[PDB]
RNA sequence: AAUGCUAUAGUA
RNA sequence: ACGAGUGUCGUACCAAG
RNA sequence: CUUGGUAGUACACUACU
């Protein structure tokens, strides 16, 4: 109701006003106070300002466009010289910044491990290996620094000959601190392979030098005795990458590694991956299986597996190391050992592990040495070599542990489908990259993407990027090798750009069959020798960025780096940036007039698009609803609190360690690390802050009554003026890039205001086509493809139009004439700009958002005032430096020279820095996107004006994201060379970006002819493309470590996403197998391990155990990609159907097969199936095993996992929360919890929700603290600690198994059962439950029939017939055709149960009369599953046995009810996003067919034929059925049947066929006769006049309306045009009106003549008749540049030009045309071009249709969809696509040998191209053959049509991307369907006869007859597999 | 081909 | 030694002789 | 240096999809 008058007095607003010119100030002040309603019109203020600024906008546009002539095509083109100069500058800069070392002894280990081949002779017993190690160590020869220490250690761990004593002592210790060592001869044993130091066997000097220098244990000065000294200032030291000697050494090291590791192990390769998924991998691809087996046979795999296993052992043995005890770790290899030197307990804070590898090799030079060796020593038998000491943390140890999966994935990705790549090189590169855990390779993997991409681009500034940004960090030799590889790739990229060639594009005006880049291995590989395709080249470029490990950054240094960056930007802005508005494109300035004009135009368009925008914003963002309902306001994310939190931080004397802050007393005190107390006391102006969860902060605000129960938008508005100071902290994202980014965190107050403003911006941004932030996920990939397709079109027809007459003259010519005519023609140009913006938020002008807010017409003046006040306050926000950063800074003792942090903090006087110009990253995404889209619109306008100056053609599409820009530009012109156009476009892109306060990152921006690069997505030439390998790498890489099932679920979801992006089937199976193997390793579940569940369940192998119970996945790959994580149960049920169902019903529909599940006997079921069905029924449907103690869990926290291990619980984090104290004190109350429990029992709505009101939300959040799942969710848990806990404590109880329904020094993650006794408990409880036929009926009824999607997928697996292979030429994106017909529940499961709890379907946020259907479905589930009756019985029996009601038990039961209801409703929700398929689907049948075809064989994709109506939506068809629904269904049915009848059937037999269809067929599960009755009774009978004539002869009423609706001008098309946009078909057109009728006859680009049968001959009626006739929706563009020579007299059609391409068509005389054109010749020249000639005659107005006449006129023709309604007028039926023809159902139609029902069911033979059928395969034609005793094939083909068909024609498009287009033409007489079938039969039968001969004599030879008899018998005996039928048929 | 107001692991 | 770094860090901590 | 005691995650992790 009230504004904020204090806004006009804000200093920020005053500066903004003074910066502006005087009239603009008045305009802004008027716009702020302008209101929509009280004004006469809503679009009056925007119009005023737009008119005011139009002059300046137009002058700027014209001046920018005029630069086209001043552009000389010397654009920034990369070449060899640019790369060389940039490399020299980079070398100089790197030398200046970092110290360069030329000595090889300065290298860091490339891989922190050394390996040698195993010894077959020596056994694998631990004691024998230990004795051998001791003897080898004691036998070292020679002299060195540490040889004495190593000999002494060998003496210490030597056990002599008392092997039996050692074994029995170790067993005794393992049978069960201050462990006492027994003197085993010379050893001092405390445990298995652990030895205490022996001062008697070693010199003290040797021990000190080993533990101080070699290992670094205690070598430092403890940071207290290190005062003002030993602090060495030095630059980072790296090797010389460009040095010839260093590169030679690196190459030698790589060669040695290749030489040794290539040798085979010499053993049979067997492992989990093989034994589980080998068959599936081999079926998907044999080459992938061969490559994987060869990998398993090599020494690389054994090396990496040994390293992983040894590291897993090292981490396990490091828990209880003493100060003077060193342990020994072993592995599978009997020659590789590690010594774990004493260190801290590794599960503590930032604890590291110290180890040194020992390798025993018979010969020297037999040791894989990746720069980690310390020395090889000769000893007894062979040599012994020991590596340098290695210290690593937990995250690096994790990566090293999860190495083999990454190695295998990388090797299989690089090698896949490439025979010219040597596998050893790939495996060498992969083993060196995957084992990298250092920043060196991480500093090269990311920049290489940009370097090679900009080198390959048409134009780029790669020289600058190399000179300034590229900075290799070469501390290892492999880093030098990779740097040389990158340099060579950058050199080669330019030379091989021309080696990319486009594929032959196929056009149909509705779809593009073929597109993309040609598949020729011409490009040179990057990381290793060989040749690669463009897709493989891009994969090699982009994949290595995902090799990087996450969390390799160290907090001590990265926090300082981020603070330095932010403060440097801030100080540069403070000291150099003063002006705001600039017209010279100054940096960090905005042009005012242009910005205002563009904003006004875009706002006008957006508001004009939708009338109701304010409401759209209010409703979609819960503006009118309470704050508790909004999700982001109730999340568990972090939030900032500013106040007095001294006590909390203090809970967790010494000197401050900083000379500046030391007082007199502080001098005489010990130095110590800064904590909160010393920081607070010393630092005068320190603001105190803490971080608490968002929901906890909201609860605290509700307690203090800051926020009430008023609608959120009202609450946000009052706080915009109630909050005046903003504080923001920051932390490090921990990303995997070279430089980590900073993440800004703000308080709850700022959060809500930013939420409101950005929702306002977002709802407007969703109304524009440019911004891609609005779409979710891979929706962008679909858009990119659509834009590419439309540009490709526009280019094709524009180039054809501009050069059609030139090409015609060239054809008529056929040397010198060809040259000049080719010179004088338009040139097609396609340019793609892949642009990024540098420092999108840091160096961004924030004053344009003021104008954006002020010009918004959907806001009241008070709202504008409050939002502007909020923005002004935001400009005064202060960044709070984190306490850890202050601790680092205050612990220096040496003053940094250019200390920017101290400079900006008043010498660390305060921890707040006033950040003004920088709006923090991630806060203003949508406003920035809108402004960037406005800038792109300005750029588009400039480009259009410039192209108009050249009189060319333009098409600009600018994809917009937050800071990622994709601008694609298509130009057709003939005035100047293309290079000048490219230079002009790039310069104006710079100018347009600068005019709006942005700047394009040319240092990372590049331009290509074909490649589209939007955000992480590719579109080569309209073919969607993506690097799917990143999903596999991420799945194999970072893990949550939360639990065995959810880990596997995340891995399988990543595999599913990769499949969606085009992963070949074999690599997906490899990824799934690797995921299962890694999950088994993490929890010790391999065959024979501790937690192997195969012996605890009635299952033959792991394939028969559900994933939830730690089984392996068994499902078809196409089925997994469709749903995922429910495929196991679905496949199990499908297998049960395939087995038990009777033979009669097996190839029936899945519903029909389920219909006889009652006939099944429950007794004759195997144990495994009974167990799995009990699992399904009870656990999935009516949960009886609680996965945890479900005490405070809402109806949201149930997954599918049954055995969920407990996780960490952090006492400190909970004690931080303000609501946790309330929960504890309420729990401390004598009976407080019971009152809350019974209050919830009285209000069960709070279980599903979290409390719509204030008080109920308070109670719900208090109650949720009892769950111990929500408690452990708020806890701090890191993958590293969880991984080390899993690998350390495997026997600890971690699982809480309460059972069916219900029934000191404790660790943090203690549980109830030990993960193994849980199997026994689960099986025991399952034995109690019983199974009946009703239970099975419920399981099939719900998991399958409830969802149409499940019925459909099971239908796909039952009715599938695999067909002919064919190449993957053009890929396309199709999401899910007719989704709504497959969705059971409309709304989200949260809303459905929300409307179920409150017994009212009218809940806010949902749709009434749609909640009705959903609640009906839900209620149905509860009723048929007895979900309520069983709960009531249980409650009654519990109360009876107890004798009094139990609130807790009732709460548990009710929570379980809502929880299983939520799980059931969520199970019916499927989120299937965009897919990449070898074609684009038209129906669900086509989509499923494409999926199955693409997801079987990697090399080729097949075509599948669902035998019996796969969709089978019997219940769904009843749902969503309406009057118009049936009427639309009938229209499509009859269009399809008529067009099929006259397109494929012989004309003389078309009537009987139509009658047979209309009598005994059905469409969409609807009888056809009913549809015909609908057609006859419908009003629009005229649309099917030919059909009504051919059948039933219904007339006189349709005909009268047909000659009657000519009241408005009606247009008919006597013959359809073969190409509508390319202008290439026979055209016959007729337009009829009042006493007027014109008929147009022409072919392709030439119009022959036009007959005008006008009523009167006067030359005045002719013009009015012409304009009236040609002004109708004829659809003939009249763009036929076939201008006709003019003859005196007569009349010509001509088309004048009207702007916006609204050409006006008129009829004119010769003399009039000539006179007007000569008059207009006087000094844009618009000339009327006469096209076609007009014949004028006088005719009467008599009616032209009589029912009797039709039979005579139509006697000659026999066409069902077309009849001659007049002599030259044809009545026609609208066409429809033939993809819908599958929905037809009926008995086979027997036309001799041919069966027409299977023909019309066939999709490959329904094509209208003679060539596509003449060149088909027998397999496609086989399904048609139905012999019935026939021998002659010709008898059958007589029924096929003999009308001429289309044949493809090839043309060359003249454009800078050279490509050829292939389209259809009319053809000839001999090109008929029957001729094509005859040729196909002859060719394919000959080929089949020669293919299956395998006999000396021939095909019909008796021996071959017997062989074919054996083949058909094999099938007549073996069960019908996927491909048996086609062999028999052919 | 399509057309109903609520259409509801990743990116910087 | 190793990790990190053109920011001083980690390189276990405390008590006693 | 020698003999004893201690240590569960760098207690931190956002804004939009
Ligand atoms: O499913 C769509 C379309 O994809 C599919 N289809 C097109 N071509 C097909 C084919 O060759 N074989 C099969 N099996 N399916 C084919 O059928 C549906 C489109 O049918 P169609 O009837 O061709 O679509 P129209 O746009 O022509 O529909 P209509 O409502 O008649 O459009 C009127 C609108 O377009 C002008 N018009 C009509 N016709 C026939 C032409 C023409 O031949 N050339 C030009 N230049 N314009 C035409 C009407 O005058 C008006 O402007
Ligand atoms: Mg980009
Ligand atoms: Zn036969």
PDB file of C-alpha atoms (C1' of nucleotides) in Angstrom, chain A residues 177-178 204 349-350 555 638 731 751 759 762 922 926 1210 1276 1278 1281, chain D:
ATOM      1  CA  UNK A 177      46.210 -50.666  23.298  1.00  0.00           C
ATOM      2  CA  UNK A 178      49.468 -51.626  25.115  1.00  0.00           C
ATOM      3  CA  UNK A 204      70.354 -44.107  16.086  1.00  0.00           C
ATOM      4  CA  UNK A 349      41.092 -34.498  10.460  1.00  0.00           C
ATOM      5  CA  UNK A 350      43.136 -34.053   7.268  1.00  0.00           C
ATOM      6  CA  UNK A 555      41.645 -24.673   1.384  1.00  0.00           C
ATOM      7  CA  UNK A 638      23.085 -23.156   4.310  1.00  0.00           C
ATOM      8  CA  UNK A 731      33.690 -20.396   0.079  1.00  0.00           C
ATOM      9  CA  UNK A 751      17.427 -14.610  -0.140  1.00  0.00           C
ATOM     10  CA  UNK A 759      10.983 -14.942 -10.262  1.00  0.00           C
ATOM     11  CA  UNK A 762      12.221 -15.467 -14.972  1.00  0.00           C
ATOM     12  CA  UNK A 922      24.417 -16.984  -9.250  1.00  0.00           C
ATOM     13  CA  UNK A 926      17.468 -14.177 -15.231  1.00  0.00           C
ATOM     14  CA  UNK A1210      27.355 -34.473  13.753  1.00  0.00           C
ATOM     15  CA  UNK A1276      28.389 -32.905   7.718  1.00  0.00           C
ATOM     16  CA  UNK A1278      32.179 -36.127   3.107  1.00  0.00           C
ATOM     17  CA  UNK A1281      35.451 -40.136   5.383  1.00  0.00           C
TER      18      UNK A1281
ATOM     19  C1'   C D   1      65.443 -38.476  22.189  1.00  0.00           C
ATOM     20  C1'   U D   2      62.812 -41.671  25.959  1.00  0.00           C
ATOM     21  C1'   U D   3      58.301 -43.162  28.725  1.00  0.00           C
ATOM     22  C1'   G D   4      52.771 -42.252  29.113  1.00  0.00           C
ATOM     23  C1'   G D   5      47.838 -39.786  27.528  1.00  0.00           C
ATOM     24  C1'   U D   6      44.659 -38.034  23.361  1.00  0.00           C
ATOM     25  C1'   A D   7      42.387 -37.378  18.217  1.00  0.00           C
ATOM     26  C1'   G D   8      35.253 -39.475  13.528  1.00  0.00           C
ATOM     27  C1'   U D   9      34.996 -36.121   8.761  1.00  0.00           C
ATOM     28  C1'   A D  10      38.955 -28.992   7.650  1.00  0.00           C
ATOM     29  C1'   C D  11      32.073 -28.770  11.704  1.00  0.00           C
ATOM     30  C1'   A D  12      31.547 -26.422   5.259  1.00  0.00           C
ATOM     31  C1'   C D  13      28.840 -26.920   0.859  1.00  0.00           C
ATOM     32  C1'   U D  14      24.434 -21.863  -2.965  1.00  0.00           C
ATOM     33  C1'   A D  15      21.560 -19.678  -6.650  1.00  0.00           C
ATOM     34  C1'   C D  16      18.950 -21.784 -10.583  1.00  0.00           C
ATOM     35  C1'   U D  17      17.441 -25.652 -13.394  1.00  0.00           C
TER      36        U D  17
END
